[PDB]
Structure formats: structure tokens, C-alpha cells
Symmetry: C2
């Protein structure tokens, strides 16, 4: 919420047209658009007792479907102390039940790494 | 509102990832994404002395800016009896006051014509 408004504000300053999903089918929390590049950021997640991050099957599938249909890149936003990290959703492990977990090995991207991937996609589209 | 929910439902049936702008630097009412194609639909408008649909300067400029930033195609949705028409925002006439009006001549697209333009843009991207 304060985290969401902060990401939104920072993506808007970076020239993105940003929309926060309103409150049946799940829509990623943040939709950021810049010159044909669609970035989808999921801020909601669950944690196990140990801190293993996961997204339940139905939530995950809904946002994956939103991503798949939109042609946008989906990320799971992870709250760290004073920083946000973004895991490409394809880096999460799908469990036999269909839940998506962020394994400990997981390399998170910072907002700046995301914007750089966006600027790179923008440059690949012209070329 | 009932019109908005209807467009959303129809675009979702057509394979679009759709988000309604929440309840400000403006966000178009409807954002529909399909395979890299960004469609922005403005439903809110006013009627002038001649019964012509228009968008006020500040609202228009904000949604035009959202479209420029996002790389999406902006449309003004016009409620006709029993039908919805979509005018590409670039077809609207900018008045002396900076308002954007839909001239009588400009016959918009129906939702199906929009989807066809989207499917065509999707096919041009592969080729």
C-alpha cells in the first residue's frame, strides 16, 4: 500500500503509465506500461513459517493468465528491509499442487533492473 | 458503468487482459491488453450544444499523455442507441479551448472493428 504507492510513484517518474488494480479473476496489483512494454507486478504473496514465499495456485494462475494474454512480463514483488525486489514469475518454482514458490536460491531484481529490462525491450522492438 | 462492465466482459471474452481504472493525472476508464497491443478506452464524455460528444481539455490531455507514455491506442467510447462506437482519439477535433470533440461525420468503430485492428497489429508484429 505505502509500498505500492512508492513503486507506482517511482515507475511514473521513470516515464511509465501506471495503473493499480482495483479492489472474480485476479489482476496483478500494478500494471506499468511504457512504449509498448507491459510490466505486471504482483505485490501480494504468502510466506511459510520459515519465510519461503509462495503464491497459491488460483491467484498465481490468474495473474499468469493476465500476463500471458496481455503479453506482459510478470514479477512478484518481495518486501525486503527498505528495499523491494522483483522476481520474474517464470523464476518461481511451480509445485505439484500448482503453487508457485520463491526458492532461497532466487535472485531478485531491483526496480532499476526492471526499468533497464524495459528500456532494453523498447530498443529490441525498433531493431 | 453497465456499459463499462459490458465492454470489459466482451474484451475479456476476446482474450484481452482488461483492467478498469480505479476511482488525479488521468487514467483511461478501460485498459485492455492483448499480446503486446495496448488499447485504451475513455468512456466518460460530455455533450455540446449540437449533441456532439467531447472530452474536456485537462481530462483529454491526461489520457493522451497516458496513451503517449504507454504506447497504447486511445479511443473515445460513444454510447449510441443499442450500440457502442469507438473513435480513435486522433480523429477528434481539438477546439480553441483545448477540448476534443467527435464531429458528426466521424463514424467510429464497433468493438469488433477494434478487436480486428488488434488482431491485425498482433499479426504485423510476427511479420
Amino acid at each position: 500500500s505505502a509500498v505500492e504507492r512508492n513503486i507506482v510513484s517511482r515507475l511514473r517518474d521513470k516515464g511509465f503509465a501506471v495503473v493499480r488494480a482495483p479492489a472474480k479473476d485476479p489482476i496483478p496489483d500494478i500494471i506499468a506500461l511504457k512504449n509498448g512494454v507491459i510490466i505486471l507486478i504482483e505485490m501480494k504473496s504468502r510466506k511459510d513459517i520459515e519465510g519461503k514465499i509462495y503464491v497459491r495456485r488460483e491467484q498465481a494462475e490468474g495473474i499468469i493468465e493476465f500476463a500471458r494474454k496481455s503479453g506482459g512480463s510478470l514479477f512478484l514483488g518481495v518486501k525486503k528491509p527498505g528495499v523491494l525486489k522483483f522476481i520474474p514469475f517464470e523464476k518461481l518454482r511451480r509445485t505439484e499442487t500448482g503453487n508457485y514458490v520463491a526458492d532461497s536460491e532466487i535472485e531478485g531484481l531491483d526496480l532499476e533492473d526492471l526499468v533497464r529490462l524495459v528500456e532494453a525491450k523498447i530498443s529490441r522492438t525498433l531493431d
